[PDB]
Every structure is written in structure tokens, then in C-alpha cells.
């Protein structure tokens, strides 16, 4: 369910159960689902993690241990 659409290109969204409008999925579980498939949503729109931000979900991992 999408609300508050703007020209800058911003909106809010929340996720409900498939045919139960009273059952809103909690936000901390939608944050875990987006973290699992963030690289797959970025490739579908040709954006890369700084031009598609989620405002409360920040990218974490990745050690730069280059030289052997």
C-alpha cells in the first residue's frame, strides 16, 4: 500500500497480509526482507544503493582486506 507520492520521487509503503487488511506486517520484519533482497531490487531498476534508499535501512557488510 503506497501513500504520499511526490515529484522528487518519494513515497511511504507498508505491507499487509494477502487478503486480510487488518493484519499489517510489522516494520522490523519488512526491514529484514528488504535486506535479504536489496541487491535484487537494485538490479531491476538500475540503481545502486545510494540512489535507492530506504531511510532506516543502512548497508553494513564488507571488509576491504585486499593484500595477501
Amino acid at each position: 500500500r503506497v501513500a504520499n507520492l511526490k515529484p522528487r520521487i518519494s513515497f511511504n509503503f507498508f505491507v499487509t497480509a494477502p487478503k486480510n487488511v487488518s493484519d499489517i506486517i510489522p516494520r522490523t520484519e519488512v526491514e529484514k526482507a528488504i535486506r535479504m533482497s536489496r541487491s535484487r531490487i537494485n538490479d531491476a531498476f538500475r540503481l545502486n544503493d545510494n540512489s535507492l534508499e530506504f531511510l532506516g535501512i543502512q548497508p553494513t557488510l564488507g571488509p576491504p582486506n585486499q593484500p595477501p
Partner: protein, 72 residues
Amino acid sequence: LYYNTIISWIMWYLFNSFQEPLPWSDCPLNENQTGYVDECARSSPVDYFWYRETLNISTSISDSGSIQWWML
């Protein structure tokens, strides 16, 4: 005597070339890989490569430490 230490510093930056991400281009991670090192974020990464990864500088001229092998 001291102009041969400036050339000692210059050829340290020459050995740390020949790699495409240069070592003074980005901040290192600390222990848990979640945030940067604290003084690399308040200062600049280049300003961090000189005072902590080349010189390992102290806070005064009174406080001195070991010989700092790489420089030697």
C-alpha cells in the same frame, strides 16, 4: 641529515603506489566492520594516512616511543 629523512618519506609514498585503490583514498574499518575508524571520520582519509599510518605521531615532543620499523 634531515633532508635525507624527507626523501625517506617520499620513497615510502612511492612504494605505496602501483595499486589502483591508493591507500590514501578510503577509510579502514575498525573491528566489527560496521563503522569507520573514529579519527578517519572526523579528519580526512589522506590526513589519516600521514599522521597514523606513515608517522604514527604522538601528542607531544616529550612523548616518544619505539623506532617504527617501516620508516627505518
